[PDB]
Amino acid sequence: KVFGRCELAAAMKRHGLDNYRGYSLGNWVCAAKFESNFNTQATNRNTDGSTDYGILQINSRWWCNDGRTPGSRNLCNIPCSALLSSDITASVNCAKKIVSDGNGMNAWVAWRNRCKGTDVQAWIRGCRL
């Protein structure tokens, strides 16, 4: 499904992402906007044979196993199919692991290039959280 901005903000806050590992909620909402345009079903194929899945575009080479990616490490220990659900729990749980591995939100290029450096709290402005 396609989430609305405040709708996603509320779901992410309920899932403990606000200020997780030092990243305020706005960062996560901004990343999702530019990574998948708030669509839980977005997929992107990469040159290395990997694919990015879901609202947070989680990669199959390191994080989830999709069964067609060479050198897959499955660090979140979940099939990539689970990250295409309308429910964001699995994606969020994996996202928490990705940010904890020691490089914060730099794993997400859309966040890195289009969110970082801007006023990200503007992404949750107007929402009841």
Sign of dihedral through CA atoms 74, 96, 102, 32? positive
The token duo for 122 is 């503007």
Using CB under 5 A as the binding rule, whether residue 66 contacts Cl ion is answered as yes
Using CB under 5 A as the binding rule, whether residue 43 contacts Cl ion is answered as no
Using CB under 5 A as the binding rule, whether residue 94 contacts Cl ion is answered as no
101 has binding-site annotation: yes
Sign of dihedral through CA atoms 105, 109, 110, 112? positive
Residues 74-93 that bind Cl ion (CB under 5 A): 79-81
Set 7, 18, 35, 48: catalytic member: 35
Q: How many positions of this chain bind Cl ion (CB under 5 A)?
A: 4
Contact 8, 38 (CB under 8 A): yes
| Residues acting as catalytic residues | 35, 52
Residues marked as binding?
A: 101
